[PDB]
């Protein structure tokens, strides 16, 4: 309906408005009027998007000059499609309640693989070759040679779009990716090209983080779209990790082997400008020198170029000309396809990065591999250390960048992890007719022994027996699925092996089915499917996984799926690989961040992220348990999101397994009664 905010009226598709949504709208309007950045925290994945879009539309209607372009970067494609359909529902509601159309355009952006109509490139599963084949089929040389109408197979969507799709605009009608594909195939145009032509004359647009955090594509996709624009990163509790990974590259034997294989073909094509032909040939041996050197670690971000300018004595300036060479020399060579060519491009990108960005980075070489440490595997990784590098181009080009997610409990660490000036410090806790979650921390077991996942007690028999007993007697009180998270795959397998050794895992098996998540994508998918089908009926099942796994964030445990979420110990990242310690040192000597504080923050952030996916929707309910006494300390409880803090009473902070089971039984018994809306 029509909500009356202090200086505006906003139409809302839903007649009923929760107080949390109203307060969130108040705060967001305050931020928009403040013309500054900020950070938000909401506990519901659904219902945030509709309110955000409604307030954005209301603000655009009220102040067309203040806001012109909107960005709603999300994590994956399902979020993009769901926000697109939510915007479509909002627009339909506005049309039916108002009666007249508006000239607002909304499109979704993705990879060229997602948006393509050629049936010759869809079946293949090469994401690194689809773009190369698209460039080969249509490019500047293709356009030049199309004048004589050469009889050769090539893409023709652009050859029609440039003559028919560059004149007719799309002032009205928000279009989804499937809608864009349908329009392109009915008009004989490329969806990507029409999307590129239509972003300039558009109201809102959504895409992934990789189109803004990665500088190699953000400039191409966003250069002069709007000086005064609003961008929001929903579900960005791990924004620092993706920012770090944006400027992170890895090198192995395969890359150098591929480069040395393809340079011969490149030279053969060339012999059929010279400033780079001889320049590229001798670059390989400098990095292959570390292959033959058996050393543990070499760190010299500033001195790496100094050492490069000694073995071959090369100036640092021409490195800056490498990247601009990619768009110049390669198109002259008429590359057939980008296959067998990506490592050469990434080597140039790495060289440009080390030539330019060396103030807050580190070069790491590791002669270690999993289960085959020292055979032949010197891995060089130019790991980034500061998350501010990937966030400057969006803070300096935008006005009201907002970072919101389901877990942003410490609002004082994000503004200092990355250069940020928050003006909000706002948190919201959802309320319903009944308490939909019952968090509790289980300390010592029935033997009055702590069940902490301490490193020195990982092999301890007593803690494993207590964990098994807790999982057994817990599996008989909460039905149809329990999701358990462990610290690591090694610890998980060592625990399940010990459980199998004793006559205890059979007791859990006869109650619920056990499914183990592995690194295989297909195996994980089929395990998830069979877990879902087993939880559909009354059989019930247990899904054992790891906090730092692709399954932790890849799926959402909606109601009736995983009524209980168990945290077996505080999930601590492994201190090895000499990558975490470098970041800890950088934060210590630069941002004055305590190492223990940052480790606890990361551990609790991961724990809350993997435990907060059991509550999706107002009607959804679930149980959350932490099987570690270390959670009992205030320094870790304070890192939990505010919407879970108030429900974590001091009564159940160190209770044993039996009383935790009793509390779970009471909560589940009292939550099954009908509630109203």
């Amino acid at each position: 309906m029509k909500l009356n905010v202090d200086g505006l009226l906003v139409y809302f598709p839903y007649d009923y408005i929760y107080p949390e949504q109203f307060s969130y709208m108040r705060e967001l309007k305050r931020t928009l009027d403040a013309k500054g950045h900020g950070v938000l925290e909401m506990p519901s994945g659904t219902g945030k998007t509709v309110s955000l879009l409604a307030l954005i539309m209301a603000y655009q209607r009220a102040y067309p000059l203040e806001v012109t372009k909107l960005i709603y970067c999300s994590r994956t494609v399902p979020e993009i499609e769901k926000v697109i359909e939510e915007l479509r529902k909002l627009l339909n509601f506005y049309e039916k309640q108002e009666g007249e159309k508006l000239p607002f355009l909304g499109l979704a952006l993705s990879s060229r693989k997602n948006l393509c109509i050629h049936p010759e490139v869809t079946p293949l599963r090469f994401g690194k070759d689809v773009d190369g084949k698209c460039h080969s089929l249509t490019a500047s040389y293709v356009r030049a040679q199309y004048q004589h109408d050469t009889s050769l197979p090539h893409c023709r969507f652009y050859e029609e779009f440039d003559a028919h799709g560059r004149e007719v605009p799309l002032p009205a009608g928000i279009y989804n990716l499937d809608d864009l594909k349908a329009l392109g195939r009915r008009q004989g145009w490329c969806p990507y090209f029409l999307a590129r032509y239509s972003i300039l004359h558009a109201n809102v647009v959504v895409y992934s983080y990789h189109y803004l955090l990665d500088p190699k594509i953000a400039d191409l996709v966003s250069k002069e779209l709007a000086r005064k624009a609003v961008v929001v990163f929903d579900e960005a509790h791990n924004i620092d990790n993706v920012c770090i990974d944006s400027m992170s590259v890895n090198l192995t034997r395969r890359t150098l082997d591929r480069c040395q294989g393809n340079l011969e073909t490149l030279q053969k094509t060339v012999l059929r400008a010279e400033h780079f032909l001889g320049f590229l040939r001798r670059l390989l041996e400098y990095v292959k020198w570390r292959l033959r050197v058996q050393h543990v670690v070499q760190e010299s971000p500033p001195a790496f170029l100094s050492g490069l300018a000694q073995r071959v004595c090369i100036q640092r300036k021409p490195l800056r000309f490498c990247a601009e060479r990619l768009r110049s020399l390669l198109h002259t060579l008429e590359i057939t396809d980008l296959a067998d060519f990506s490592p050469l491009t990434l080597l140039a990108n790495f060289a440009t990065l080390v030539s330019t960005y060396a103030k807050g980075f580190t070069i790491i070489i590791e002669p270690f591999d999993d289960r085959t440490p020292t055979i032949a595997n010197p891995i060089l990784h130019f790991s980034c250390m500061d998350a501010s590098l990937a966030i400057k181009p969006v803070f300096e080009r935008f006005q009201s960048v907002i970072i919101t997610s389901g877990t942003l409990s410490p609002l004082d660490i994000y503004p200092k992890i990355l250069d940020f000036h928050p003006v909000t410090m706002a948190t919201f806790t959802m309320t319903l007719a009944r308490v939909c979650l019952c968090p509790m921390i289980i300390g010592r077991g029935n033997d009055q022994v702590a069940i902490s996942s301490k490193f020195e007690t990982r092999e301890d028999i007593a803690v494993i027996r207590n964990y098994g007993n807790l999982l057994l007697e817990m599996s008989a009180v909460v039905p149809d699925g329990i999701v358990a998270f462990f610290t690591s795959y090694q610890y998980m397998e060592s625990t399940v092996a010990s459980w199998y050794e004793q006559g205890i895992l059979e007791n859990i098996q006869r109650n619920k089915l056990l499914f183990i998540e592995t690194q295989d994508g297909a195996e994980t998918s089929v395990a998830l499917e069979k877990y879902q089908e087993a939880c559909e009926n009354g059989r019930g099942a247990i899904l054992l996984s790891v906090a730092r796994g692709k399954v932790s964030e890849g799926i959402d445990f909606v109601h009736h799926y995983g009524r209980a979420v168990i945290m077996f110990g505080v999930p601590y990242v492994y201190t090895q690989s000499r990558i975490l310690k470098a970041r800890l040192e950088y934060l210590r000597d630069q941002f004055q961040i305590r190492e223990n504080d940052f480790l606890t923050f990361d551990a609790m952030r991961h724990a809350a992220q993997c435990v907060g996916r059991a509550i999706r929707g107002k009607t959804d309910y679930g149980l959350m348990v932490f099987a570690d006494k270390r959670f009992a300390r205030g320094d870790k409880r304070g890192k939990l999101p505010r919407w879970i803090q108030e429900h974590l009473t001091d009564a159940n902070l160190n209770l044993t397994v039996d009383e935790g089971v009793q509390v779970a039984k009471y909560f589940l018994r009292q939550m099954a009664q009908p509630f109203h809306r």
Binding site: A476, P479, G538, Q670
Partner: protein, 380 residues
Amino acid sequence: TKRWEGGYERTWEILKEDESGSLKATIEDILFKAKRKRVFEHHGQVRLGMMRHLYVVVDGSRTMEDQDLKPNRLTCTLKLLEYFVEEYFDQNPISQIGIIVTKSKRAEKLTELSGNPRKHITSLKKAVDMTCHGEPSLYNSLSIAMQTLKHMPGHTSREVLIIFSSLTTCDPSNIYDLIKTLKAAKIRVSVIGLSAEVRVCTVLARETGGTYHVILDESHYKELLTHHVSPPPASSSSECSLIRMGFPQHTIASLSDQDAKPSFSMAHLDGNTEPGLTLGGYFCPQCRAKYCELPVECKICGLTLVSAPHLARSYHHLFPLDAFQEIPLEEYNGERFCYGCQGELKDQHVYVCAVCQNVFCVDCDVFVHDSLHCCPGCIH
């Protein structure tokens, strides 16, 4: 605004005086208004019913050994089931109850589908000392119930009640196909769980049209059972539904006459002990079979033996008594004696029947509308 933030209520303004003593009239009016606090209906709900073949499924897994309900779940469940059977047979004359117990991934038909209350109670009392082992199997229990109720007549309402204590069920095959088959069979399934909500039970109840509930305590358990006691509403006319049933007269035997003929009871003949060879009892109108308990379907000729008063006790719902017309005493120009109690009419209001135009006082009108259910004047 708020209802309590306005003006303070002054309820004492109702009473007034005009002759320095008129308060007696006001208190008499209050006393008169105190009566007639009922809707002239003992039930006020469903005015009809339909024959129900109800199957009760009882979990026999280890979860029944839990002591949530003193002393354990099994004993309290069986006691409340005995109470439910008694009340259900009291409020349903021609209904039938079957009992199935699920244990060790199998289902055992503890009692045949019949209308005898004593047999069900005896079986339940015997089942108190059973052994709780294994896990329940909803698929097998529902398959047995469907197989038994597949051949039942369409006019009867087929209902299945499941008391699911354990949260896990072992299904030898897919259960949703069985749920679809039950939906095609028009079988109503209702589940009363004990621990928590289970997805399969909710889906089954929603698809079969039944209701799914979860027990909070023993009182809530009894309330749910009492709610399940009431028969479902029935359509006005479905089919040619009838049943051939007899009305065995309770003919006892006395040695004074020459027809003192002892006879062993058919029900007692199957007992291990010596069957009661009493003087007389209930003789079947068709094959002269002797029975001691009613209502019991005849073992020999298959006839149903029912007691006529039990059927007749619900006949007043078919022909409810119309509310009498309230008339002030002054405006009635006739006799001032109640036609029912012969008492003098002194109340401010007199009730007159629309049929016989007699006079009934407040007490007699309430008695007729609540208990008698028939107008004494209309009888004449």
